[PDB]
């Protein structure tokens, strides 16, 4: 659309979740040429939505897929492919090179940010309208990292959070505000979260909100609210005792708002939440211990009340199937009064758990908010690790 976007609506009433799109990438990859991806996200253009993910430069079935469990290699790009098609060697478009990304569209065209390099000489290049325009070196030389999901723009301004430093320590997270590709401004992490890792975001009423990972000492979730106009921000935790990170302790009756709810150490998983008062929904794995299942629970006022519980659920995928990363996205350009809220779930396959195959790849599964209360299905990746042997 020839004019930048504004976030002018609020969320629609989230009463159940319908299916939006699921590629069956791993089921199709026992016989077409699908690339091994990991870390998916889905982000829309004014004209189409498309799945994204980091590639590993090899197909599921080809010999170089052995060891795609390694997060970082100079063979990974951010690639897009049409909704619910597989990332296949032939329909996949490359966006930019490197091992951590984040991309979003500003109303006019799209930005895409790729981070690359060795852990202590890594570098970000912010592409905008498929041309490189800015580069950022590491500020702390320890695996410089950005969102792994859709970033969000308002009036030409798209906040990105980055983190460089350790996911065990204090690390140095830093919020940037780009416009048309250039560094407008940036800010150090302000507010109460201990460590910020890997956020997923959304926008409503001129506010960009983000749910993230406390990989340091938190089983609850640091949340960052950004004012795109003031180019300013806070961090805090989700008050609700329903813990969404994973691994997890049992859920308290009273969680904690301003510090990491403790129990688990140096471990997390990327995840999201829609924080909108009575109409709040928190996604989390069904497993306490590992990436199995995905549940969506209505927990009214979860961000604020430190004693909040579910009033309604929805299982996205059974505990006896596998889950993984999750982040949010919205069709910002979509006719209506409000924003249909949506999310994706990475279905991870292979190693380390299904170790009989030497690879690790995944599937997208994805849902969006239905105001009617629709019946539920649960949505398995679907492949049999035994046909690849």
């Amino acid at each position: 659309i020839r004019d930048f976007n504004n976030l002018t609506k609020g969320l629609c009433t989230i009463n159940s979740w319908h299916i939006y799109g699921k590629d069956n990438a791993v089921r199709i990859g026992e016989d077409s040429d699908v690339l091994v991806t990991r870390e998916p996200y889905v982000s829309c253009d004014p004209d189409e939505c498309r799945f994204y993910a980091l590639s590993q430069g090899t197909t599921i079935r080809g010999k170089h897929s052995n060891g795609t469990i390694h997060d970082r290699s100079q063979y990974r790009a951010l690639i897009s492919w049409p909704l619910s098609s597989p990332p296949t060697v032939y329909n996949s478009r490359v966006e930019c090179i490197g091992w951590s990304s984040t991309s979003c569209h500003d109303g006019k065209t799209r930005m895409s940010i790729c981070i690359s390099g060795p852990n202590n000489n890594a570098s970000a290049v912010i592409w905008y309208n498929r041309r490189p325009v800015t580069e950022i070196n590491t500020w702390a030389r320890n695996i410089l990292r950005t969102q792994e999901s859709e970033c969000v723009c308002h009036n030409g301004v798209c906040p990105v959070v980055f983190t460089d430093g350790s996911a065990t320590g204090p690390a140095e997270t830093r919020i940037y505000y780009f416009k048309e590709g250039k560094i407008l401004k940036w800010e150090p992490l302000a507010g109460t979260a201990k460590h910020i890792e890997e956020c997923s975001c959304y926008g409503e009423r001129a506010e960009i909100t983000c749910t993230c990972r406390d990989n340091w000492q938190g089983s609850n979730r640091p949340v960052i609210r950004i004012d795109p106009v003031a180019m300013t921000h806070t961090s805090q935790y989700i008050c609700s005792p329903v813990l969404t990170d994973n691994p997890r302790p049992n859920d308290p009756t009273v969680g904690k708002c301003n510090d990491p709810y403790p129990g688990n150490n140096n471990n997390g998983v990327k995840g999201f939440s829609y924080l909108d008062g009575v109409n709040t929904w928190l996604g989390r794995t069904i497993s306490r211990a590992s990436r199995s299942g995905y549940e969506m629970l209505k927990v009214p006022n979860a961000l604020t009340d430190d004693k909040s519980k579910p009033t309604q659920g929805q299982t996205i995928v059974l505990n006896t199937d596998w889950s993984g990363y999750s982040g949010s996205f919205m069709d910002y350009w979509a006719e209506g009064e409000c924003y249909r809220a949506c999310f994706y779930v990475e279905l991870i396959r292979g190693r380390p758990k299904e170790d009989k195959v030497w690879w690790t790849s995944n599937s997208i599964v994805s849902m969006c908010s239905s105001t009617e209360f629709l019946g539920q299905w649960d949505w398995p990746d679907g492949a049999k690790i035994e046909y690849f042997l």
Partner: nanobody
Amino acid sequence: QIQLVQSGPELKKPGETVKISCKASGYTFTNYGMNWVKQAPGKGLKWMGWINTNTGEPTYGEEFKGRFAFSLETSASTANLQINNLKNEDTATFFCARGEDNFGSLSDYWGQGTTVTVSS
């Protein structure tokens, strides 16, 4: 909480087959798979495999493939072990634990056991 009970302890002479049961109180059977652990008076705890109480997919640890069969009576929220062509080597106490996760890496909750004595 979850309260799995197991059948009484049998005596079966070499060659036979025994039905060993786990009946699930506490949770919703289908979203948590059954784990089966053997405890000889020897090694200590051994994993025999899992059962996906959703589809019925069974997984067996190598030493267990073939003479053993995890099965379920879904309806009863029951899981069963079956040792066929019984060896006096199988003389031991078996457990059904409940797999916290997909495949049953952690086993939150264990039944009380069922002791088989293979003997003439």
